[model samples]
Target: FPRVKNWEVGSITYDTLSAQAQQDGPCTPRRCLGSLVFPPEQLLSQARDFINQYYSSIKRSGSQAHEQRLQEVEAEVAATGTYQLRESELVFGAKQAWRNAPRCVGRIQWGKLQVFDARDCRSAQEMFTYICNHIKYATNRGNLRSAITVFPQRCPGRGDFRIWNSQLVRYAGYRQQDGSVRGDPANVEITELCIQHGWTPGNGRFDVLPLLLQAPDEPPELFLLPPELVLEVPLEHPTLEWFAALGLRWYALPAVSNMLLEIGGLEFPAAPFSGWYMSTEIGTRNLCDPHRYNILEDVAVCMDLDTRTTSSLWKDKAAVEINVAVLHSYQLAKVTIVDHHAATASFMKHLENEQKARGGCPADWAWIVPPISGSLTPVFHQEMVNYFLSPAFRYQPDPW
Candidate 1:
């Protein structure tokens, strides 16, 4: 058991719940491994273990249903080298994956996520249809809901289903002659790939990129998201009328397509997840970060703040207004967004919830703490335990 402390509250708690989990190494004791991108189990053993977990969750561990499920999984894998999850089992595992992801601060809504079982999808065309439905269901006309669409699992003798885009909805980045980016720099490579695949590039800062879906052993098919399905929120300051002249905008949906959803030892390379955004994620990290949109100095100059000296705290002042604009814009548009204070506070309550339900909750402090005002957030003072749990959303290699 590890004794964790909260600096602000002067409170201490012990995490003994990690006792039930399986450990492969002394990977987390070094402390620095908390935020590193580190990157499964064999079929029979992992499959049986998950079946045991699923059965136990229903409080029927020793019942015939439980034992029968274990044998069915083992017997199927014995003949076919793998097995399939029941629809109900798939639902359980998807929710568990969200709950097990230590890096997700929004895990407080884990149990309520809507899972779309698209395992029957066999072509890129079908995948596009399934994706549109997931987006429509989750969007709910700007009232974003938590959801994930699990595509076909990786099976033997077949190439895996893949989504070439990192996020289902992201703005394109265009590299100019001077080597500066005209849009989101993080998406330069993907944007180039989009053009290469025959998309007539949009000439704007916030052009929504097309989705590239690839079926097993097939060339990627391009599917442009319907303009109506992709709800967008125009960025503007509440009081600064001049801010509207900048014409900055962002999509309401933050659906992520690149994350792999692993369940019961089965690999789902095409499962994508999304939900409402926290204001800091859009304003502080995405817009203000130097490597991202790099809009801080531009907005600062618009406000006529002193960029000549760091003592003036021009960037800090500009950042506050930018976040305010995002929050106010989302609210005015009736889009779902949470501010940092409320988000971190709710996370604290979630921590208490998990601690009581399961002796400990695995958390990554580096990610749980907000990007801006690291020290000001409650999670900043709290010590966290980072560890891997099965039924997880792991990163997959991007398909070129």
Candidate 2:
């Protein structure tokens, strides 16, 4: 037997056997099996540093350079009048970088880890719910004000409503077969009912009534228009249940456990994998004391069921969840901490704590500013977030 280089829970690393040893000893060629002493913390730290540095640089440089290069590429692409493979190109680049890593002996491992004392798939499901409900619903100072302003406006008369509705139908290409634009027949029917009943803004409760009645047939067009799809559906609301029914699960606990053990040995406070699980899915049973952990909020990612194009929707759903959750936490932390500290010292202390928790300064914190008129803030913020995590788009694996 080969000498043990290193040993851990069910795994080992060692140098290969020499030609003489392979033939003389009762072992196959280059078949030496021993443990290597490479610290898990070191590996994890390397991974952490690699990710942090890569992402941080991407955040800083990519926003500016990518935008410039994207515009240039788009211009050239438009001239060609041919479909360009932007997403494929990005994936190719990532693959190449991983493949080329000097210490990397082979392709990087990728999977939804679920083995050996890990948080089950329940964590991912919970996290997704958290994002969709809390983060997506949370609005900033500007959005809240805008909603308050418009929520009280009266529903226009049938004639006026139809006129506005017609424009929406025209833009969305929902015209009648006869080439006449009848405001979505379903919407038309609804409007008739409202008119007949003399539905007024005050009586209808601007926020509740319209929101409840938002039809799938005719979504609002332009100008804070109604979204094309309903956020919630009536009748059992089975989306979450449907996913749960699949009995699926995943976990990154092994990665976390390995990283922690390594760090302990390496004497590092934090390393690349330092107590963090990336876009992971852990099952319910192994979840560390949920009541103590206390889910701050639920998160979600929505996809267009109709879109066959991956480029069309659902890209970077994980990043969106991460960002929105962070933003929500930051928002709550700011209000809670700021209110407690009329005293400057108290305020600074709280602010410092927030910054440390969030892993950066206030300027670096991910903020979700809603669409604001006459402001560069929204534009820049969108660009920055998009740079780190691309938009949600359909994942079209097969282009044909």
Candidate 3:
């Protein structure tokens, strides 16, 4: 038995689910690949396994319908080297991929995601429309709902339908004349790519980048997101009235665009998914990380704190208020957001539920713990096992 002890509570439990991990992680038997920031398959057998998985989930492992579906899959695959998944099969696979995602801390809502199939998407414009509709549904005015739109699968005869942006709703990163970035530095490449492809660039720090959608072998088309469809919350601290003057704001949807959704043997290169924010993601990592916006020192100066010394904890204090503003603004705007404590607490509950449901829960301890408060959260004291599973979201090379 693989045992885990929660050092805070001194409660020990054995993980029996690690045995079901379909693939090896970077670990060499027991050694981890290091929790450092820097860190698929074939047809027939995989198809059988996933189809069997689907049937097993429905409590009909060996039913005639199940075996008939298997035969149907085999017949199609033998003729074309691949088979189609029914719409219901696509939905189940999408949910399972989220559940099997090792790095997501918000997977507690994995099963509740809305899956929109865009397999009939014929052009880049249609892909953008499907994606815009996904945004409209997922970013419901302010109350964000988890949703994914699955585009056409990668096939032998056609090029992959691709979303070139890392996220559907990321701010532009304009490389300034002084050789520094003015917008979101993280998106500099995508911004440049958009401009090179004939998009008129905006000079603001928070310009939402247009969708560079590629259909088959066609040139990636730039489609600007309708302003009304993209909901954004302006950052404002509940206590520090001056915080509102910073003009900091973030979009409502954390819709990752670059990841590929692998279901059974099929690959959907344009399956963009969205979930609500955990406040620290916006405040600490996105806003305060030195390589990010690096706003901690600015906030510290505004707070009248000493920023010269690490011992002063000015960075920590400023970060706390930034997170506070994130939560407060989202609350006042009536947008969906979760503070670290509440998110981690629910994740702990998710762990318990997964343990009972699957004998083990796949987790990456480094990611599960919130970025700002490591020791303050329950995930810090608990050990976790990380492994790979499919149907899953996988990284695809950027379509430049």
Name the better of 2 and 3 by TM-score.
3
lDDT of residue 277 for candidate 1: 94
Which regions in candidate 3 have their CA more than 4 angstroms from the true location? 29-31, 36-41
- State candidate 2's TM-score: 0.17
> Local error of candidate 2 at 34, Å?
36
User: lDDT tens digits, residues 1-400, model 2?
Assistant: 2222211123322212111120022223576312211212233322233333333444554466444544544464345322222333323323322222212111122111111111111222332232222212222211210000000101123110011221111111123468542222223333433444444322211111121112112322212223321121111112333333322222111111001111101111111110111111121111111331111122122222323455533333422333333233333333111111122223233323423442211111122221111122221221110111111111111100
- lDDT, candidate 3, 1-400, per-residue tens: 6898888889887888777777556668567675754452368888888998899999899998999999988888878777899999999999999999988999899989899988888998788789989999999898889999998887786788888898999899998779789989999999989999999999898999988888887888889889999899999999899999999999889999889899888888889999999999999999998888889999999999998889999989999999999999999999999999999998899988998888778888888888988899888898887878878888777787
Give the alpha carbon lDDT tens digit for every residue of 1-400 in model 1. Answer: 8899988889888888766665342354355444465632378887887888898888888898887888888888887887999998889999988998888888889989899999999899999999999999999998889989999888878898998999999899999989998888999898998899999998888988898889999988889999999988999999988888989887788888988888888989999998889999999999988899989999999999999999999999999999999999999999999999888888888889999887778888878999888888888888988777888888777887
Which segments of model 2 are wrong by more than 4 Å? 1-240, 252-304, 314-351, 354-400
* Clashes by residue pair, model 3: none
Backbone N/Cα/C clashes per model? 0, 32, 0
lDDT-superior candidate, 1 or 2: 1
lDDT (C-alpha, whole model) for all candidates = 0.87, 0.22, 0.88
